[PDB]
Each structure stands twice: as structure tokens, then as C-alpha cells.
């Protein structure tokens, strides 16, 4: 179960994997039965196959942290970042905060991505 | 129950109240039986009297948002901010993300403040 420093490293590497768009490496960060709520407020998606389908649909994309990872001492953390993408030939940016809980093996057990339309910029 | 735009306004006003240090106005934002986990990972504190005691102990302090509020459509949001304080005559800064759930009256029902020692700068 990752320490606070290890959560900082894992969550930063998640953003680097989203940024390059390595779907298979992203999926491997998740527990095999993880859930993703993205955006938070919508129903969870369950397990690596569903999660892979989500990232493949969603991911030229750039992602970068826009402030430090905030980690806890119970395997969780939160981070702010910006995703830039191209939508109907119109580039846009989305500001997001992800909250993650890691399991006892260092895998993401739950992902909650906070954002709404108010965080999109076209 | 606040809409996404209303969550953005409520969470920004919370930071303005922390920044000026108005304990009674901060406490009034919370539901009478709210909980606070600060830092997340520690046991919750319950109800306005406990919450007032927490802010009075904790709060010259400056607080400002360091990126936009990320709101949901189910009365929740998350925000990144920086708190500057004076510790043993040594000014320091703490980077934090608060995750809030508001109730059906617009009051904070749950507060979870993500940060650890790794987010403190002396
Ligand atoms: O975790 C995420 C959240 C929002 C958009 C892309 C992501 F990879
Ligand atoms: O919500 C908070 C979190 C951390 C420090 C001060 C705060 F007011």
C-alpha cells in the first residue's frame, strides 16, 4: 500500500501515461476489478475491460499536472491537472481533479474525476 | 442542492472566509451535523461545535485558490488551494485539495482535505 511519497509518484506517472496515450500502461495501473467515475456523479465503470474501453474512446491529447499531488497516509491522493484535446477540429482544454484510492498492491482501486462543463474551455 | 455553478460559488466563498479568518461565517457554511476529515486519513470530526474548535485552533493566515473549482452535477466539488501561515515564527505554505459534498440546503455535509507533510513548505 503506497506511502504518501509513493502515491505522489504513482499519480504523477498516471498523468504521464495519459499524456502519451498509452492505453495498455494506463489500464495496468488499475486493479483488475477497479472502478472509474468520470465525471464524478456519473455511474461507475467496473473492471479493466470497461476501463480500457473508456480510455480508448477518450484518448492528440496532452495532460499535465497544474499543481502538486496531495497524498494521504492511507493510500489515497488527489491532484489537479489540465487535459488538452481536439474536439470537432476545435482544440479545447478541460481542468480536472482526480481523487484515487490505491490498494494493498499499489494498483488504483477507485478513480473519481471531478469536473463539469464549467471546466471546459474551447 | 447546489448546481455545478453554485458549488463553484460556495467553494470559492469558503476559501475567501478561510482567508479572512472568519470562524463563525465558516462554521455557518457547514451542516449542523457535518463532518470534517483534515487531513484525509485522520478520524472525522462531527458537528458545528467540534468544527468551530478545529478552525479556531487552525486559524495571520492567507488562503487562495491555485486553480479552478471542479464541480459535479450531484452537489459535490473539489478545489486546489494554498494556505500560508506562520509556524514557530517560520512562515510556511501548505498545498491542499478539498473535496466537499453539499446537502439539499446548500450546507457542507462532508469536507475531506487532502494533504500530507509532503505538501508543506517552510
Ligand atoms: O483521469 C482523467 C480524467 C479526465 C480526463 C482524462 C483523464 F485521464
Ligand atoms: O479546508 C482547509 C484545509 C486545510 C487547511 C485549511 C483549510 F481551511
UniProtKB/Swiss-Prot annotation, chains A, B:
Effect of residue 98 to E: Slightly reduces activity. Reduces activity 10000-fold
Domain of life: Bacteria
Pfam families: SnoaL_2
SUPFAM superfamilies: NTF2-like (SSF54427)
Residues reported in the UniProt entry to bind substrate: 98
Stated induction or repression of this protein's expression: By steroids.
Recorded catalytic activity of this chain's protein: a 3-oxo-Delta(5)-steroid = a 3-oxo-Delta(4)-steroid
GO biological process, alphabetically ordered: steroid metabolic process
Result, substituting residue 30 to S: Reduces activity 4-fold
Result of changing residue 98 to A/L: Reduces activity 100-fold. Reduces activity 10000-fold
EC class: isomerase
Active site: 14, 38
Keyword Isomerase belongs to the record: yes
Documented EC number(s): 5.3.3.1
UniProt keywords, alphabetically: Isomerase, Lipid metabolism, Steroid metabolism
GO molecular function terms noted in the UniProt entry: steroid Delta-isomerase activity
Subunit structure of this chain's protein: Homodimer.
The protein's name: Steroid Delta-isomerase
